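Running co-folding for magnesium ion.
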Amino acid sequence: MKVELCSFSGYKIYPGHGRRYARTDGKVFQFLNAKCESAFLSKRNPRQINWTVLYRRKHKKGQTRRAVKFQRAITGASLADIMAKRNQKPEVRKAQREQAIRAAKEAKKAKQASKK
Amino acid sequence: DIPGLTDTTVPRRLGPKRASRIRKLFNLSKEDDVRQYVVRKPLNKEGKKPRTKAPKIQR
Amino acid sequence: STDYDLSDKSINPLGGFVHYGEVTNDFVMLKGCVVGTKKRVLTLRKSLLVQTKRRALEKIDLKFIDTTSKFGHGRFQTMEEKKAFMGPLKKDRIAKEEGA
Amino acid sequence: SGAKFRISLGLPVGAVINCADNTGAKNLYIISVKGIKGRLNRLPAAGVGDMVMATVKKGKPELRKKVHPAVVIRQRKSYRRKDGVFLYFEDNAGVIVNNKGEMKGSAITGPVAKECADLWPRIASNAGSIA
Amino acid sequence: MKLNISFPATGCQKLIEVDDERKLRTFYEKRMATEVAADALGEEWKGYVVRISGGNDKQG
RNA sequence: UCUGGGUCGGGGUUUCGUACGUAGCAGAGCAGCUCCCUCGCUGCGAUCUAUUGAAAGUCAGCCCUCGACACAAGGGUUUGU
RNA sequence: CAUGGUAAUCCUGCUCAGUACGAGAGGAACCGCAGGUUCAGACAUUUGGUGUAUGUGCUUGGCUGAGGAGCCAAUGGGGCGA
RNA sequence: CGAUCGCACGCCCCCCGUGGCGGCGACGACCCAUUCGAACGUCUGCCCUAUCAACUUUCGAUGGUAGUCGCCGUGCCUACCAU
RNA sequence: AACUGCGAAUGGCUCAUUAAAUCAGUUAUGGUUCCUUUGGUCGCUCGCCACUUGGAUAACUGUGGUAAUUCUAGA
Ligand SMILES: [Mg+2]
Ligand SMILES: [Mg+2]
Ligand SMILES: [Mg+2]
Ligand SMILES: [Mg+2]
Ligand SMILES: [Mg+2]
Ligand SMILES: [Mg+2]
Ligand SMILES: [Mg+2]
Ligand SMILES: [Mg+2]
Ligand SMILES: [Mg+2]
Ligand SMILES: [Mg+2]
Ligand SMILES: [Mg+2]
Ligand SMILES: [Mg+2]
């Protein structure tokens, strides 16, 4: 019930089995048996050996999304504040638009009067 | 509710700055009092007179 | 089955004990090696001494008992583990063909 | 604390192993092992973590014809690490130390066995990786 | 071990120190950006699913 | 004996490493047939791919069979307070 | 069970303890703990060795008309191997 | 094949009445030219030494052909040739 | 403060390398590139946002890790 290791052949090596190979360049390899360690030490490619799991995988042998926006209060305008601002649909927005229209009209008339 | 974690909602330090983002937040369609629908942040320090600061809108 | 294993497996290795048979009755699992061949009768005796060292009187709690095949280089613990790893074979394919 | 368990030795007297430090020596020829009481006809032998006396055969002249204490850090003989792993390295290698177990060099090339590392803290410091 | 617990819907992140390894064993052997149930953190965390966003090693 | 032990067979385990045959518009190329064909169609060709973790062995001192087959109340020499 | 044989040995580390002692420098021991050396008696789960299971691939020369399947070369050679 | 920024601000008003127009710039650009250059080449020129007289050419040495690469010309590199 | 832009390839130092090499004078690039400055070009193309489109991150608030660095994570 230790850490579970994998081999040259990709097989599972249970505790008390096989040998661990520590190369001089720092790489550490573990093998299930001397058949696997001889193939590795002879520089044999595991993808060309039919019982290796790398071969059976190379040859294919045998085999969320969301977008949630959470509303939050901000400094100066609470959640109720922004709700009251965004719920100005029933003719309040039109009233603001028409008062802006008349403000622009009176500003333009004042500008014409001042220029002339 | 977890004590002090899932409750007592804290506010964002500052609201939208791009006029498109203000309109998106407040459901503005087009050309309705946009410069006065911006959120004004109130500064109310004890040692100074209180006032409210408005951000410079962009685009 | 240890409490760290929780596998429905017996002490018998995959393929049975080599040169003995299948263990079905009670058994005693002793640390280390024991004189005699396989299926040799052994006499177990209470200690004549008083066990006072720390090697004795120590609670042995097993985390895992190996049950790989001893008839070679076994690499699987149970029949079901072997079947799950290795998938269907030709024998099982023709057996399922016959079963239909 | 903790005492080093017995391991397979595999390096008798007369073995020439690599010298993994930057001291300037290329190899160490083992002439004896520390702590070996001995037996008739039996060659003293050392594993990883063992302190040997060695002479360097290839290396600098100021090192060459002299006896140096050394510590074995990698062995090619497989040894069992009390947890069922049988570990061996690609080559036999050691480093040159003084009588206090302090390295003459300042760096180690390649891995250092755990048995040697925890037994010699000074070598563990200069070790690159621990295997 | 410490846990930097953050609830983005309300902010208010806070640190919870957890010592019992039985609480952390449900977190162990997982990866980042994975959602796990925090029910092993006592009854107070029942009904909570939390995503492992990150962390810092023993050396920082 | 509420049977027994054998001999084959089966299953398991395990060892090696993917059988013969067949098929392929896989294949360095080369050689024959062109009312043809409009890129052909016939071969030779190590090797490759699929069938195929296949084929083969496995107690003789491996494990389990309750399948098949016959055989087993037979023989000889002795032994008494 | 008469009788005969007879077996275990030594060292290191931690702690004791920077302690006793000592002006200082230096510097122990008993208990306990963890391991080694030499020896002994076993054993084969594991690692290694062997390997003519002459088990299974590969391969040289020859031979059976070829294929297939094999064999001979005093164990043909070689890989892996219960 | 400008979704940029500043400065004082002004003209047209029929259609009207809120829009359309304007100057000075700053920043930005595909390309061309210039400036600064850079890079590689042309010709000629260097100390002692023959107790250094033959070098280079397998592994580019000299040249050709077609390419690769490079900002570009070129054995810079590759393949095939010539020696 | 931070993002963006530019500069950091200049200057300064030393003379180890280097003998048709560097370098000096001469000439060429019709065999190449060139920030910046300056001058040209920016309605030259027929082809339900344009009164202006989308998203993220800084800075910033807050929770930290590490003995340590001009180290940085999550929100
Ligand atoms: Mg702007
Ligand atoms: Mg076995
Ligand atoms: Mg002798
Ligand atoms: Mg059988
Ligand atoms: Mg006696
Ligand atoms: Mg004795
Ligand atoms: Mg032959
Ligand atoms: Mg044949
Ligand atoms: Mg013959
Ligand atoms: Mg002969
Ligand atoms: Mg072998
Ligand atoms: Mg010089």
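Result summary
Residues 16-19, 34-35, 38-39, 42 of chain A lie near RNA strand G (CB under 10 Å from a C1').
The CA atoms of residues 23 and 29 of chain A lie 8 Å apart.
Job closed.
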